[PDB]
């Protein structure tokens, strides 16, 4: 599967029939139809103990991986019941600044989207959490092009080392708190992974406020490759899935 004409999102249903399911992601967030729900609690992001391990180009995005053997970096509160552990974060971006996010807000696309993936610890490991309707919680953050985000720079600087598919580099002591917006206001709805296998195990929490990154920072993302070393070079750009039918789900807003 991939993102090109012949293996892109419109073809994914043939190998993963869940592509046409009832709670697929991403979706367009219509701000006027979202329901303010006053019983939604504040989010609790406790990332002071986080331990990053490595950064990896996996052929469709680059992931920073975290040590999740202990409650080191956790998400709770919000719409969640239970503690969810951070296992990795990745981005989806475009070839041009006016496209790149997966979720849109009143049909507006942003330059990129950050996903911080968490799994529900009551299920014991990640592989069990993908068997449950509330197994995962992904925190989504929009990126707009503007001033440099200083906290993103270590990530941008290592990208040359993992240019092609399969490469990795040790990436310790990166603090994910430098990627968070000021406000933790959010929208939440029940959804899925946005890449195959597209499992419907995710409570999505999409933050209202985007973070700014510079043009130079998002250009470095665009220099990555989909292909492996020694293959024809395919630039890793536009690795996003288009919005899916909300199909009678309700988007709740914390504000």
Q: Could you say whether residue 115 binds Zn ion (CB under 5 A)?
A: yes
- Nearer CB in complex with Hg ion: 23/103: 23
Scanning 34-42, 192-200, 226-234, 242-250 for contacts with ligand AZM by CB under 6 A, the matching segment is: 192-200
Q: Contact 66/54 with Cβ under 8 angstroms? A: no
60 is catalytic: yes
In angstroms, what is the minimal distance from the CB of 132 to ligand AZM?
15
Work out whether 158 is an interface residue with Hg ion (CB under 5 A). Answer: no
CA pair distance 249, 53, nearest whole angstrom: 36
Q: By CB under 6 A, tell whether 64 contacts ligand AZM.
A: no
The reply on whether position 246 binds Hg ion by CB under 5 A is no
CA atoms of 209 and 186, how far apart (whole Å): 8
Q: Does position 119 bind ligand AZM by CB under 6 A? A: no
DSSP 4-62: STTTSGGGGGGT-GGGGSSS-S--EE-TTTSEE-TTPPPEEEE-TT--EEEEEE-SS-E
* Torsional class of 133: left (φ above 0), alpha (ψ -120 to 50), beta (otherwise): alpha
13 is in an annotated binding site: no
Contacts of 70 (CB under 8 A, 6+ apart): none
Q: Residue 103, interface with Zn ion (CB under 5 A)?
A: no
Q: Which is nearer to ligand AZM, 131 or 215 (CB)?
A: 131
Contact between 201 and ligand AZM per CB under 6 A: no
Site for ligand AZM contains 114 (CB under 6 A) = no
What is the distance between the terminal CA atoms of the chain, rounded to a whole angstrom? 38
Shortest distance (Å) from residue 206 CB to Zn ion: 12
Nearer residue to Hg ion within complex by CB, 35 or 128: 128
Is 103 marked within a binding site? no
Q: Is 138 in the site for ligand AZM (CB under 6 A)?
A: yes
Enumerate residues 203-232 that contact Hg ion by CB under 5 A: none
Structure tokens at 57: 């180009």
From the list 11, 60, 103, 118, the catalytic residue is 60
> From residue 210, how far is each of 17, 33, 109, 130, 149 by CA, in Å?
33, 20, 12, 28, 11
Distance CA 120, CA 86 (A): 9
Going by the annotation, the residues of the binding site are: 90, 92, 115, 194-195
Task: Catalogue the active-site residues.
Answer: 60
Q: Output the known binding site for Zn(2+).
A: 90, 92, 115
Chain residues in the site for ligand AZM (CB under 6 A): 88, 115, 117, 138, 193-195
């Amino acid at each position: 599967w991939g993102y090109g004409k012949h293996n892109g999102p419109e073809h994914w249903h043939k190998d993963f029939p869940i592509a046409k399911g009832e709670r697929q992601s991403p979706v367009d967030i219509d701000t006027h139809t979202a329901k303010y729900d006053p019983s939604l609690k504040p989010l609790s992001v406790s990332y002071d103990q986080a331990t990053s391990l490595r950064i990896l180009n996996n052929g469709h995005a680059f992931n920073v991986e975290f040590d999740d053997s202990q409650d080191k970096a956790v998400l709770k509160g919000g719409p969640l019941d239970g503690t969810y552990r951070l296992i990795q974060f990745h981005f989806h971006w475009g070839s041009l600044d006016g496209q790149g996010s997966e979720h849109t807000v009143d049909k507006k696309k942003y330059a990129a989207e950050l996903h911080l993936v968490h799994w529900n610890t009551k299920y014991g490991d990640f592989g069990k959490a993908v068997q449950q309707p509330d197994g995962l919680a992904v925190l989504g953050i929009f990126l707009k092009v503007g001033s440099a985000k200083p906290g993103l720079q270590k990530v941008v600087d290592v990208l040359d080392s993992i240019k092609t598919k399969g490469k990795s580099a040790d990436f310790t002591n990166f603090d994910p708190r430098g990627l968070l917006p000021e406000s933790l206001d959010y929208w939440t709805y029940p959804g899925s992974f946005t890449t195959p296998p597209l499992l419907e195990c995710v409570t999505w929490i999409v933050l209202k406020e985007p973070i700014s990154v510079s043009s130079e920072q998002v250009l470095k993302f665009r220099k990555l490759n989909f292909n492996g070393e020694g293959e024809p070079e395919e630039l890793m750009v536009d690795n996003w899935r288009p919005a899916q039918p909300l199909k009678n789900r309700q988007i709740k807003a914390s504000f």
